[model samples]
Target: AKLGAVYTEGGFVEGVNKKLGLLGDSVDIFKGIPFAAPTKALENPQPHPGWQGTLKAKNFKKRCLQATITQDSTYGDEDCLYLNIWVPQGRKQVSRDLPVMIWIYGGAFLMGSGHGANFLNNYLYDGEEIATRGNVIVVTFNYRVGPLGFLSTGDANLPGNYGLRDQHMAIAWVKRNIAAFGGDPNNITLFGESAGGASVSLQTLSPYNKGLIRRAISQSGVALSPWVIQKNPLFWAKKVAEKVGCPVGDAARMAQCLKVTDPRALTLAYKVPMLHYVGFVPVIDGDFIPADPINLYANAADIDYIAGTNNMDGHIFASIDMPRINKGNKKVTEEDFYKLVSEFTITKGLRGAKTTFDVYTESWAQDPSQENKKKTVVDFETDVLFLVPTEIALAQHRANAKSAKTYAYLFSHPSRMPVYPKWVGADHADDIQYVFGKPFATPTGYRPQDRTVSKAMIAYWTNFAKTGDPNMGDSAVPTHWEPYTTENSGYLEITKKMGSSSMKRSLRTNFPGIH
Candidate 1:
């Protein structure tokens, strides 16, 4: 059998068929397929001009330019728009009509790639297990990120959201060309976590993505999330331009100057001042994004969506912004808590800092204990940065949607790796391990329970991709996973013991005012 010989309009490409004893199956893997032409800095993604000979697509490509904040270093290239595909192989030849799952990795839209590397697991974003286990096609890709991808002057000069446009182009390319790779273009599911999740939600709002996406699963984020869109992109765009020694007076010239600046310097120029903060992100560019995402979400009533968040999605972020929250034997003082709350509230352009602080701290006031203070701070962070926005998106989708299905979930399972404090329950990006089936792919350091959760997650995710509904009677997922509504507001709590309940009992226990 020709393991990975496929002919697309672009050209003939050959991939590799590798056998994985863990999954008891062989899979055809295509790496570094040019979904779009190599992108220039601060420009729209162009169509791939097509290839000449049999393009050897067996190796990964360079990731887009981004800064590694922890290491205080930067790396990657300018021309880095590529994608990877994993197709489940059959004994002989299989039918060319499998469901497609496209992944958008999340690093605050600044640092992520098709080949995301993690210290805990090497195959963090690898799609081989999900593809082979779920009998679907899994695609992952690298889009421009950081200033190079999101620096917008708010007009055609530099509309920003280049990264989002890259995602749209990739989805469009897949819809047009995926049938050649045994995928059903009509049944495409886009899924992601954090900023990537927000991208998935944003794509649903765009009028341009009519036939590109049929289903979307946004975990731990949505377009309504406070940090997803920049209200003043030009402010930050000029800041970066000044830092890179570019002309900031003329928007178009500033864009051209930034386009030629050193890619690493461009990436290093933008910096986030605090937690739940992003220097560069999606904007209402009047083209890709078009208008306010919340208003646009009302028009996207036709797309099926699964929007959700982790229980303590802000724990890690809170700690990062205020390390004293986790300092050895240290606790957040009442003064510190109030100051932090007010500061964060103001940064998000909200005016209820005092009111929000009072509401969250009433319980702490009654208790006045160190534990209570820390818990309340994290809860405030979780609600403001992740939970409330997700609730808003779910409601908009439900009220606007005609026949489209909307599901909500709260991933309550904590990480098993001990990378975070036990009290910091399912923090941001924690659910991605299970969504990508990481435990099954790289089993070391994973518990049996971890594998069980991974299996259940894979079942629900792929089931949603194949059928609009996540519950396909899979034994691993015993719960019905009910649809979300403005009245019922029921959500699936994904834990060791998965079950369904109303928001009043689950989410509102923390934030009662959430409607």
Candidate 2:
């Protein structure tokens, strides 16, 4: 029995204890493995020590520091730098290398964990069925969130984006050690939704992550989205530090104060009106992230990527505000709607504004029925804020590399649950359950139709992982997803009904001036 050889339950090597039940028969699951040291206040994640022996990875680790629903409830600890893995439910077959998929969960850079309810096996991937069938390895991990992850100290000595650094460290760890878990270290695909999708965009352009990952899938997010980058970390950090009762003038003193301050106090400081005014996001720390991700993509054509946005990203966030809208006391006038659009669309110049408006109008035209007026507003908001930026990214990536294989998609499947009205279309984050093959996680009862969609999503994603190209085998998916190019200018629309695929060259042609 050769090491790394694949086999079923009958072929388990005696004396080796299995940790995850998924691996009990023939798989090997390792959880809570540290990829980097805990990043203390103002310091990046330090390199971790190698294990002395084969560590038994049995439990999920705590998430990194993040906000909670109530004051008394805290969701993470500083010592939360860990990752989890799921290999095929069989020994590694001889000469058969399994593709690896690393998932970066999204919670708006505020909340999420590798072990969260949304990511749990019973909820996300249906316990390795996707992996076992696809012969792939799946990985997930946690990084710092909120103020701890995004604060900037203004001093070069004290930078931010430790959360992103944590992600890089995890990738580096996988590059070095995934082979031990029946995976190919060199063949890894990085994929995520929302902030996770944005993280994938950042990874593609990051010099520090060169060669650590080979491919990426960015779902419903883009690197250049207005909310994606923070302008100045030092200024924001000083404001946040002062809110938490720390001296604001010197970076070293601030770092020292923050190190000893109550974590809860620091968290609350970010919520203050004054500190909240300062944008907290992944900062352009000169070292870790060399330059803006958009600029990086402009120069690096060597990386392979497939990215897109959801059909109704607006409705996902809008759903949060539905209670207020349904009350009927608040009615938005046309002028009020225009003002809202102005604030929502982050366009800089006349040229950019034209493009922004075009994308917005096209999205709004999708559902024009009188009953779906609110749905249109949500769709417009999401397109302006998330989908447009993603489209721009896809176009830019394709322009940089004529031969580059980039697939853009617009997810349009409505969740089976009535909790989400059909008008919301495919709300943001709705694709997660499908991509991971776990429709059971939907709030309403999962439908057989949803399971079919999940299987298709897994096939498309895993196939993309196996090769930079997403076309599975010789059969095209129900949708005719075209490679984004200035000439064709088309996108693939994915829906629940099979054989319902089509292409539209100028989906946003109505709103002029936008590419």
Give the range of the ten consecutive residues with the poorest summed lDDT in model 2.
Answer: 6-15
Predict model 2's lDDT versus the native. Answer: 0.67
lDDT of 1 by residue, 1-515 (tens): 23557887678888888876554567888998888898887878898889888988888888887888662687777777888998887656754788899999888878888888754535677898789777889999998888888988778877788898899988998898889889999889999999889999998889889867888999887898778888888888788888889887888788887888877778888556265467688988888888888789765677789988998888877887667766658778878877877776643444466667677777786898776787777877787788888888887888898868998988877766555455735778889888778877677768778787888888888888888788862224657888887657888878776544423233332344232
| Cα-based lDDT at residue 362, candidate 2 | 64
lDDT of 1: 0.80
Q: Each prediction's TM-score against the native?
A: 0.92, 0.84
What number of clashing residue pairs does each candidate have, in the order they appear?
Answer: 0, 10
| Steric clash pairs (candidate 2) | 5-92, 6-91, 6-92, 6-93, 7-91, 152-233, 153-234, 154-234, 355-514, 358-511
| Best-matching candidate per lDDT | 1
